[PDB]
Amino acid sequence: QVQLQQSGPELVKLGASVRISCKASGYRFSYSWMNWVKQRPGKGLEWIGRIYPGDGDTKYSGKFKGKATLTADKSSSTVYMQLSSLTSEDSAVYFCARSAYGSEGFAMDYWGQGTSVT
Amino acid sequence: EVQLQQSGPELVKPGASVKISCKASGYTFTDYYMNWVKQSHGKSLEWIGNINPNNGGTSYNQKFKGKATLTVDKSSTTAYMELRSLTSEDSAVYYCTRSPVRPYYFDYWGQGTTLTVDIVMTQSHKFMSTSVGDRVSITCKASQDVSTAVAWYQQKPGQSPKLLIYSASYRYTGVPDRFTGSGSGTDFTFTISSVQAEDLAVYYCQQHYSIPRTFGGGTKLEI
Amino acid sequence: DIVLTQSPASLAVSLGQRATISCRASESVDNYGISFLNWFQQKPGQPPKLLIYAASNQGSGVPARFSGSGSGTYFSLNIHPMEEDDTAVYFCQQTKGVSWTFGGGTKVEI
Amino acid sequence: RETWGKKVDFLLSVIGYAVDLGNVWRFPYICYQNGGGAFLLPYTIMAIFGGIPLFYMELALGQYHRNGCISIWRKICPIFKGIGYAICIIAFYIASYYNTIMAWALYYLISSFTDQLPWTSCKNSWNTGNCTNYFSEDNITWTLHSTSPAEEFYTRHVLQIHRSKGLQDLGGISWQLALCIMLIFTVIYFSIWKGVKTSGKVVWVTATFPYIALSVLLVRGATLPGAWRGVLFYLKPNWQKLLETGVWIDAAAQIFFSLGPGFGVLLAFASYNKFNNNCYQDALVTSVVNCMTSFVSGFVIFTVLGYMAEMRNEDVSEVAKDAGPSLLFITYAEAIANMPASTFFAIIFFLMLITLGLDSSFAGLEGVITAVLDEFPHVWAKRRERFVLAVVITCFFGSLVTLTFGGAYVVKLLEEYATGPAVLTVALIEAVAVSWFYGITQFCRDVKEMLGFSPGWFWRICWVAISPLFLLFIIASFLMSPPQLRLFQYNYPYWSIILGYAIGTSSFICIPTYIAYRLIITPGTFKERIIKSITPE
Ligand SMILES: CC[C@H]1C[C@@H]2C[C@H]3c4[nH]c5ccc(OC)cc5c4CCN(C2)[C@@H]13
């Protein structure tokens, strides 16, 4: 069975940095896009970034380019989202998602448990 | 999980047609090639043909143009192989197999049923032997240049073959750490680290570089 | 960037009545014949479960009550008569690059 | 009557039409099937006996008369004036074929400017489910329903073929190809619109840059590993395969479409100069340079496949069995991004692949436009500039049949019959009418007065005995077996195969229609009405 397992939560100091993990298993992770999304308490969703393990290309929007860096390692079956210059506005839970294949519209199929960055 | 179950044996008069069936399970029927293999009694193994269930296409060795025809029925996950002009030379055991694309290799093997009535490979002597636990080696030579497209099999007495080494240097899933390999171009070597009594079986040296699939002469290690 | 919007912000779906949730956009998302708009499902403390592939095809582990259709700049999440167990906020994604954006979200409950 | 300038421009004009993107498809695709070197030998035999004489007959014919494709037959034999119309109708089908293909290549040239060629990674626009083309350290298997990025790119990013299901259900138009197709007719317009006098300078660059680009591509693949396996796979002869009839028909077929007589384009070119004492020297170089160019053409492809086949851990055989174009647009595209020198050679090949088409597409319209204008001087005298616009717009709607109907379902169906027995039927009757009814002694007379020398008793033996036999052989080869073909696990139904046969059959209905027309309006009795139509001059 497919599953996405993140790391545990972590408290943040103003101006600190965190390192969320997300291990893929049970599918060809090296041929899909690994997503990252915010879930702020009281608002909707806000997309952060995206990466293709195997190539390393990344695409950002929503002003996250000046706050986030994302990498991946095909040999370990993991994708690591790094974040710096955190503040109170970044207080939210972050999810990891597997992008479906493009013939079906890249609907994010399965999800991780989410980790709190506050 | 995957299985390939044939029908039983049968005797047919010389010159008449004979048929064998094979049911598949544990995997999607359309996501692999249904290949067939020939085993003349007391001889090496030889490829028969190939089937594409997605469109009914077939591809087979040039010697089976006026001897056999291939087909399947995907609605029941069943495969058939029709033979014609049967003769005494065709007394052989035929195998039902699974084969994906690019290793042009036989993934798994059925139990095999008895029937009663190009680039080639070569090997060394079929009496190479040594005591149990010693480092063993087998030599296999190619008639033409094949880069790394070679595999190795294990056929115990009364059992079907099985894929052991993959791309001539890596051991397939389900294979102990004892077996290793190496080779490039025309010189291929099959080694055994700490050979055991259970490894006393017949081996084969396959050509994957191009269709038709061709094998070697076959050697056995005893002891 | 493609901006997605939704309305009504909160649907008073009485038990046993039909519900429809729209997803308006600036584009023009129809590319290569595949509708690059999807639907998810959130509950309190639960992951954003998938609902619909390409705004028309049901999802894995998704009940048959949920479906969608449309073309161009306006889709709608047509849903069979709901129960209280379907209390969840539904979000509209767009998977037409460069960027992938989300909608504001509508609260659909009893 | 306007005449052409330097002799060489002529030679560049003809060879640019002689070599095209078709030679990059069929020639390398047919050789190894017929045994590689075992196919090059009959390719050379039939080229000497079958290729050159039908090639120089048409150039030598236009040399003397200078009348085009329609009006010339008023002088040769009046009963065969319908050939020029048959070339025009067939040209309308080939004009569509050719013009849409370059839009698929122009889609690559515009996209190839990006350093990250979207040919190796199924990024966020592909059917990534059946996408895997990174041949890692034995942690992969290739399933039957599996594909590569380049297979998907030519599948659902050029054709958008998933929009449509078959010939019975046709899709819409791609906006990208709609802009690419118009740019192609733009350059085709100005090249002929300015006049045949100016087209000699357009072929000055387009007929020479491919030969440079062949060298630019040849040095790369040759210096990499695996080239020895690629060249060996191609030139290693399979001698016993030569005993089959299919090899001889394919060898005779390749020389015909490689040289391309009977299409009226070669005839129109010789009609613009006397060519005193230099025509036999010009045509003979084209036939050998055309055959050597195709040899070098396929020699580059397999030289690049050899480097892959070393990387791919397999033989070049059983690789991209689908079709000629689908092989080149996909397979050779993969190699460009896999060569370390990418971002440059993606431009070089798909700038010559378009240039080979454009140069050959420029020449195509000149044959038709030369034909009609020679018949209607009230159009040529004042509307010669407007007449070209009527043909280009006419060819635009001809090419539109593919784009706004979903994908390549019209192209491959139109491929097998637009250039089928119709073009061979024309090429046959051009040989029969000029040789048997129109006395070959008179044609041999008309040529030797212009050249200061006669090639008679060698070519003539070939013209009256070898030429009708080995042109009727290609006709008799086609009636035996119906080519039930396929496209991407989709077999074509029966009614469409008959439709393609009907389109190809009706494409040359002009020559029975015209003969039937003249014999009804002609006065006299049954014998007299036939003599008046056959009477030369
Ligand atoms: C020299 C190679 C020849 C082999 C086939 C026939 C011939 C040809 N005839 C035409 C007539 C009209 C036209 O546009 C209006 C295009 C062509 C072409 C296209 C390129 N090829 C294909 C040439």
PDB file of C-alpha atoms in Angstrom, chain B residues 30-33 54-55 101-102 104-105 144-145 148-149 166-167 170 209-210, chain D residues 135 137-138 140-145 228-229 236 310 312-315 318 486:
ATOM      1  CA  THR B  30      -2.479  -7.436 -20.655  1.00  0.00           C
ATOM      2  CA  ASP B  31       0.629  -5.981 -18.940  1.00  0.00           C
ATOM      3  CA  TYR B  32       3.114  -8.641 -20.096  1.00  0.00           C
ATOM      4  CA  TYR B  33       4.147 -10.868 -22.990  1.00  0.00           C
ATOM      5  CA  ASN B  54      -3.497  -5.890 -26.546  1.00  0.00           C
ATOM      6  CA  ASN B  55      -3.895  -6.430 -30.314  1.00  0.00           C
ATOM      7  CA  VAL B 101       9.709  -5.176 -21.906  1.00  0.00           C
ATOM      8  CA  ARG B 102      13.426  -4.219 -22.214  1.00  0.00           C
ATOM      9  CA  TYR B 104      13.249  -9.212 -23.145  1.00  0.00           C
ATOM     10  CA  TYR B 105      13.574 -11.746 -20.327  1.00  0.00           C
ATOM     11  CA  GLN B 144      28.349 -11.631 -31.941  1.00  0.00           C
ATOM     12  CA  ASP B 145      28.657  -8.446 -29.894  1.00  0.00           C
ATOM     13  CA  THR B 148      25.396  -6.651 -21.353  1.00  0.00           C
ATOM     14  CA  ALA B 149      22.147  -8.349 -22.458  1.00  0.00           C
ATOM     15  CA  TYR B 166      19.770 -10.112 -14.277  1.00  0.00           C
ATOM     16  CA  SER B 167      21.700  -8.107 -16.891  1.00  0.00           C
ATOM     17  CA  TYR B 170      22.731  -8.345 -10.643  1.00  0.00           C
ATOM     18  CA  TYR B 209      20.326  -8.252 -27.165  1.00  0.00           C
ATOM     19  CA  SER B 210      17.977  -9.081 -30.062  1.00  0.00           C
TER      20      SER B 210
ATOM     21  CA  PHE D 135      17.407   3.498 -17.872  1.00  0.00           C
ATOM     22  CA  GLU D 137      20.660   0.487 -12.606  1.00  0.00           C
ATOM     23  CA  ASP D 138      18.120  -2.306 -13.128  1.00  0.00           C
ATOM     24  CA  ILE D 140      12.858  -0.725 -13.932  1.00  0.00           C
ATOM     25  CA  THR D 141      10.872  -2.814 -16.345  1.00  0.00           C
ATOM     26  CA  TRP D 142       9.105  -1.728 -19.493  1.00  0.00           C
ATOM     27  CA  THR D 143       5.477  -2.696 -19.744  1.00  0.00           C
ATOM     28  CA  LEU D 144       3.646  -3.025 -23.022  1.00  0.00           C
ATOM     29  CA  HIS D 145       1.326  -0.130 -22.339  1.00  0.00           C
ATOM     30  CA  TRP D 228      30.412   0.977 -34.680  1.00  0.00           C
ATOM     31  CA  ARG D 229      27.358  -1.056 -33.657  1.00  0.00           C
ATOM     32  CA  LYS D 236      25.790  -5.783 -42.539  1.00  0.00           C
ATOM     33  CA  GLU D 310      24.847   0.738 -26.332  1.00  0.00           C
ATOM     34  CA  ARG D 312      19.743   0.908 -24.119  1.00  0.00           C
ATOM     35  CA  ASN D 313      21.220  -2.600 -23.608  1.00  0.00           C
ATOM     36  CA  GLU D 314      19.436  -3.866 -26.724  1.00  0.00           C
ATOM     37  CA  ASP D 315      19.720  -4.130 -30.495  1.00  0.00           C
ATOM     38  CA  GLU D 318      12.670  -4.095 -32.604  1.00  0.00           C
ATOM     39  CA  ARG D 486      -2.126   0.525 -37.950  1.00  0.00           C
TER      40      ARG D 486
END
